[PDB]
Structure formats: C-alpha cells, structure tokens
Design a protein around this ligand. Structure first.
Ligand code: SF4
Ligand code: SF4
Lengths: 190, 123, 210, 77, 121
C-alpha cells in the first residue's frame, strides 16, 4: 500500500505480541510435582553433579620453568639486529624503523665512513616504551631488525632495559639459527 | 543521572553584572565558611587564616575583569573548584597545588637584578 | 539501491529544512550520513522535533562531541549523533560555540546526554547552560587546562613526582628525558588527492538556463 | 544583651586595613567608617558568626552593612 | 476529559515497561482529534509543518476509524505496537503544542558567518 507516514514496512513481526503469562492453574505439572522440585533441590544436585564430573578428569595445568606453552613462528619478544653470512652488520642506516614506531622507541645516529657504505654509530631502543607491534620488523628493507621469540629477559634496573647497539648485536648473535628458521618459515606469508 | 551530587547547582548564565556580583559574593561566603573544614579534611600543616587569606587573594586576582561572560566562566570555574574541595574528591597533594610558596624555600639565589638572572642565563 | 537511497536521504533532509525554516541553516549529505546545520540558540527546538515527530523520532543520544577549528571566530563546533531505532536511521546535528559563550544542554530531553556533555566540557571547555553537575570528568582534579584543544601541547604543562622532603607527590613544570619529535614536518608537498566526483542527484542541483 | 559590642569590637580589632581601632563606634559603617571592601564586609560577617557558633542565611548576611545591624541581629538565638 | 496513553501496570507484552492498554482506539482517536484541533487553531495555513501533520494524522486516523481489530491496524499503520502508537501520537501532540509557541515557520533569526561552514576544500 502506502504507509501512514511516520511509518515504514518495518512493522512489528507476526507474533511479536507475546501471550499473557500463564497463571498457576494453566500449568502442566501438579503442585505436588512442583513441590518435589521445590523442597528436594532438583537442579541444585544437577549442578553439583557437573562439578563432580569435572573432579574426575585430567587437568590442563603445565609446569612453567620446565615447559613453555605453544607458540607461533611469527611471535614477538626481545629485539635483535641481524647480520649477513660472511659477517656483516646489515643495518644500512636507512631510517625506516625510526619513522614508523608508534611509541618512538627507536633512536638512531647515522654516520658514513670513507668506504661509501652506510651504518649506524648509535642504535638504540628504549624498551620501557617499545610496545611490540612488529612494525619495525615490517619496515626495514634489508631484514636487519627482527623480533626474537625470547620473553624470559626480565631485568632489575631500567638502565639495563635501555638496549644500545651492542646488546642487540649480541641478541642477533645468540638467536640466529632459530631466528633464521622462523624467518624462513614466515617468508611465504610476508 | 536524574539527581545531582551534593553541593552542585545548575550552571546558569546571568544577563546582568549585579546578579553576578551577588553570586560571587555568596560564593566567597561559601568558601570562607567552609575553610575550617579543609584544614581537618586535607590534613594541612598550617593555620585556617592562611587558607582564608589565600581564598581572598585568589579573588583579588580577578577583581578588575570587565567583560561579563568572562566573569561568568570565572564564576563557573570557581564553583566547580568549591564543589571538588568541599567533598573528598581532591586529595591532599592537589589541595597543596594552591600553596607552593608556603611549604618550603627552595634555596639561595632567587634572581632579582639582570646580573643574577644573567649568571644562569634567566634560569 | 544505494544511489536511489542517497537520493532519498537528500529529499528527506530538504523536507526537514522546509518544515522548520526558522532554525535550520543548512544540511549536507556525504555517503548515507546526514548532518543538520543549526544555530546554538536553535538546539532545543530542533532536538525536540527530532525526538517527537513520528517521521522523525530519534529517541536516543549516542555520542556528542566538539571539534575545534581555531581559524574560525566561533571556535568549537558541537556535533550531536542520534539513532532512530524504529526507522533504522542515523542523523547528525552540528552547532557552534566560542570558548566563552555557551550552547544549551539537551539533558532535559535525553537522559544519557549529561555524561557526554561534561565529557566534551572537560576535553574542550564548551559550556552547557542548564545542566546539573557540569564539572570535570576523566582528567585530574586540580588539572588546569583543556586537553583536546589546539593551544594545549602534547605532553602538557605539568608532571608528577615524589618529593622526599614534603613526603608527598608534587606537581612540577615539564622536563623530558627524550623530547617529542613530531614527524608531521615532512609531509607531502604535492596535493595528495583530487577534487573527486559528486553524488548529488540530478533533481537537487540548480538548473542551467536553456 | 551587655558585653556584646565589646566582643564584636574585639573581633573587628584583629583585622587589617583599619588604621584606627578606636573608630569602632556602635553605629560604624563597614564601608564608610572603616574603609572596607565588599570582600572585607563578607569576611567580617563570617568572622562575627564564627565567634558564636550560629549560622546565617543569605538574606540575613547580604543586608548587614554596619555594626549596628550586627548588634540588632545578635539576638536570634 | 482526560486520556491515558501508557499503562505502566497490567499484563506484559514484548517491550518491558509498556503493558497492555485497555481500549486503545477511543484513546487513539480522541488524541488524534486533539492534534487536528490544535494545529488548525494555532498554525498559519502556509506552513509545511501543519500541512503534513494534518495529512499525516488524517490518513492515520482513517485507518483507526475504519478498521476494528488490533493486529490488522497495527500492520496497516506500519509503526509499532498500539500501546507504542498511542505513546507516539501523544508525543507528536505535545510537539505540535510546543510548536505554537516556538513558532518554526518564520525566517531564520541567527544567520551564520560566511567563514563558518567551511571545512577543508
Ligand atoms: S616493535 Fe613496534 S614499538 Fe617496538 S621498535 Fe618495533 S615498531 Fe617500535
Ligand atoms: S634496522 Fe632497517 S629501518 Fe632500521 S636503520 Fe637498519 S635498515 Fe633502516
């Protein structure tokens, strides 16, 4: 038709008028049958039985200091500056990881040597304010900074938590083969 | 939120200067009357007369304001500050924002002439 | 569908302006979004008309906020958002308000609105005349300034530290260990997008003569 | 009520901006005779009511201009 | 005479807070006649507002006056339930009474500045 105006084809659906709630006398069970559930706590014992079923099965719990939970290859933990095979630092002072960081953790000083190649005098990540987005891994064209999957590195001072170039080159030294394995397994999806 | 909080009033904007003067008058009376509560409440070191002379000198700061609606916002901000102070919403470290000159003398060499400014290049 | 629907929204809003010529200055549509351009003394009657008409029953304040452009004489623009849960429609209402003049409050009509109004108050300093419990929310109690405002810097004016001497936290002017480095300086010097086409239906742009 | 104006004079004496503590007559105007501001007027009235423990409404606080009106008001308790 | 537009106690329907209204059609048609009388008395006949609400409540009142049962008219109106329809008719009635004093059919009283609805173009 034409609708009234102030009004559309979104009428109330067929059956949205819900029925009157039935009284005591339009009930299917007897009052004695209802009182057996009332006094003998019929559904209390049901929920008691459920938690007793959970008592007799084998728990989900795992030992932390001797087992680590299931992890992905694309997981992210402490940083590392990689190197080339035949020993070369691989960060070409290209300044992309500093320009993308949503918390401004990177600070790089760049200087050029006689050779014409480019490296960094001072590389720096403040880990009080790195937020683990992995954009710094995504931006570097030469794949020089990564996220090693280590998380067990909690420290006791903040000055330990300021990572300079030397600490991150050490982290790229230690984690290398698992790092290369994770990047090679990640590499089709990037 | 139907009901308001305790000491609040509906913010409403007067069209005359004399009505605003009456409202700021009643407002100074409210601060000055509630000044013995603030020393008990925020556990200050010092005396009630110093609270009262501060409330006075904070209304000295805006005595010669000409524009009506700037007096209006200034009244609304003062009533919000009364509202926070008379309850326990402000704490004793934000109540002492109001008294930075009283609590401690920072040390020697407050510069006065150009030379004392200039020996530490205007600080 | 969508071309027909945006052309229908245009006509609905043309009707809304023609029903209330005293209060509605403009309307603009951009992609199934309708904005109504309203004077600040014109807020309350338009919002009653949006609550109360049967063609126009929005019933439900969703979110309101301000936005400052400091390059205009009336600095803030206060934008309202409504949702007719009957007609499945959204509508938007923009007014204006300088730092010192008000806009009147719709908390007499919309019960959820008062909490939104004092939020936009603390972020912007925009006044809602006729509002019980106008004071700050979601900032510091002794905080001086309005944060979401273009003269206010990023890191603010003050910072907090524990003075040993007074045995309390103290509030001090700002000192950073690393300065903020915005990289907005270094944007494009070519125009990044064109002007773009229009979605105006043929019925609502002015005829050329002959 | 004797010894009341002596108490009000003792309260009014402890202030400043009064270069004559002997100028407190029982009909002294706050603004005219004592050279007081508006804030001074509602400072002295609050200090008057603080001495007793009574509390005053707004219409009975705004009207008090002289110490004569304070000694007229004093017998509300 | 008075009219009740929303029972807050009775038997429940799907919307809570809204209970079943006894005799909704006389309440409905009397509330309609109040709408017609008010906007004929108080709004001047040029204005678009009274023209569409006159036609609106006339076409809405015709459905109510000409059909009997509950469910068929609440489909023919096409808006919500009849309790809820009585509420929104009450509401448009109170609106039409506020519009006689707020007077929307004039010219606009507060012209914008020329540099105000200019965003980024
Ligand atoms: S992971 Fe994120 S926050 Fe951390 S250095 Fe990379 S881009 Fe910056
Ligand atoms: S890690 Fe990548 S983005 Fe950062 S300086 Fe080295 S090459 Fe550039």
């Amino acid at each position: 038709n034409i609708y009234a105006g102030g009004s559309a084809a979104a009428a109330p659906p067929a059956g949205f008028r819900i029925h009157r709630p039935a009284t005591w006398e339009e009930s299917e069970e007897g009052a004695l049958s209802k009182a057996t559930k009332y006094f003998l706590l019929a559904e209390m014992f049901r929920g008691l039985y459920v938690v007793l079923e959970q008592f007799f099965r084998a728990p989900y719990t795992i030992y932390y200091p001797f087992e680590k939970g299931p992890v992905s290859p694309r997981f992210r933990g402490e940083h590392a500056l990689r190197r080339y095979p035949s020993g070369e630092e691989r960060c070409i002072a290209c300044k992309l990881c500093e320009a993308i960081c949503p918390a401004l953790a990177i600070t790089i000083d760049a200087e050029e040597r006689i050779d014409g190649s480019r490296r960094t005098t001072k590389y720096d990540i403040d880990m009080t304010k790195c937020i683990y987005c992995g954009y710094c891994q995504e931006s570097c064209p030469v794949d020089a900074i990564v996220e090693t999957p280590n998380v067990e590195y909690a420290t006791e001072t903040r000055e330990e938590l300021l990572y300079n170039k030397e600490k991150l080159l050490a982290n790229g030294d230690k984690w290398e083969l698992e790092l290369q394995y994770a990047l090679d397994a990640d590499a089709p999806y990037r | 939120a139907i009901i308001a909080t305790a000491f609040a009033e509906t913010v409403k904007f007067s069209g005359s200067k004399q009505e605003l003067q009456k409202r700021t008058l009643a407002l100074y009376r409210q601060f000055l009357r509630g000044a013995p509560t603030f020393a008990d409440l925020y556990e200050v070191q010092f005396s009630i007369p110093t609270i009262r002379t501060k409330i006075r000198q904070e209304f000295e700061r805006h005595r010669f304001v000409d524009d009506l609606s700037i007096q209006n916002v200034l009244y609304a901000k003062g009533h919000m500050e009364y509202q926070e102070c008379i309850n326990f919403w402000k704490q004793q470290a934000q109540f002492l924002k109001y008294f930075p000159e009283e609590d401690d003398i920072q040390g020697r060499h407050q510069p006065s002439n150009f030379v004392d400014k200039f020996l530490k290049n205007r600080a | 569908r969508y071309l027909q629907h945006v052309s229908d929204l245009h006509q609905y809003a043309k009707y809304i302006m023609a029903a209330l010529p005293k209060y509605i200055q403009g309307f603009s549509v951009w992609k199934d979004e309708l904005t109504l351009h309203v004077a600040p003394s014109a807020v309350i009657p338009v919002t009653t008309f949006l609550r109360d008409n049967t063609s126009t029953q929005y019933k439900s304040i969703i979110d309101i906020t301000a936005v400052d452009y400091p390059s205009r004489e009336n600095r803030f623009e206060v934008v309202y958002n409504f949702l007719s849960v009957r007609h499945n429609s959204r509508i938007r209402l923009k007014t204006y308000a300088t730092e010192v003049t008000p806009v009147p409050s719709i908390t007499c009509l919309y019960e959820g609105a008062n909490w939104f109004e004092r939020e936009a108050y603390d972020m912007y300093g925009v006044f809602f005349e006729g509002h019980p419990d106008l004071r700050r929310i979601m900032t510091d109690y002794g905080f001086e300034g309005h944060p979401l405002r273009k003269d206010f810097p990023l890191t603010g004016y003050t910072e907090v530290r524990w003075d040993e001497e007074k045995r309390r936290v103290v509030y001090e002017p700002l000192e950073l260990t690393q300065a903020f480095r915005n990289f907005s300086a270094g944007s494009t010097a070519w125009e990044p997008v064109g002007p773009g086409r229009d979605d105006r239906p043929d019925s609502f742009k002015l005829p050329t003569p002959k | 009520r004797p010894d009341a104006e002596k108490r009000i004079a003792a309260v009014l004496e402890s202030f400043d901006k009064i270069s004559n503590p002997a100028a407190i007559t029982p009909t002294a105007s706050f603004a005219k005779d004592l050279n007081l501001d508006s804030l001074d007027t509602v400072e002295v009235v609050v200090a008057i009511e603080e001495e007793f423990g009574i509390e005053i409404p707004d219409k009975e606080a705004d009207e008090i201009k002289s110490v004569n009106q304070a000694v007229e008001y004093i017998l509300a308790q | 005479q008075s009219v009740l537009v929303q029972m807050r106690e009775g038997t429940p329907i799907g919307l809570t807070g809204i209970y079943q209204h006894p005799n909704p059609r006389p309440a409905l048609i009397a509330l309609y006649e109040a709408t017609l009388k008010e906007l004929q008395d108080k709004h001047p006949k040029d204005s678009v507002y009274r023209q569409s609400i006159e036609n609106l409540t006339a076409h809405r009142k015709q459905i109510v006056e000409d059909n009997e049962v509950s469910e068929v008219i609440e489909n023919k109106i096409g808006a919500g339930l009849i309790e809820e329809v009585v509420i929104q008719a009450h509401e448009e009635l109170e609106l039409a009474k506020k519009m006689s004093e707020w007077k929307p059919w004039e010219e606009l009283e507060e012209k914008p500045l020329e540099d105000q609805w200019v965003y980024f173009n």
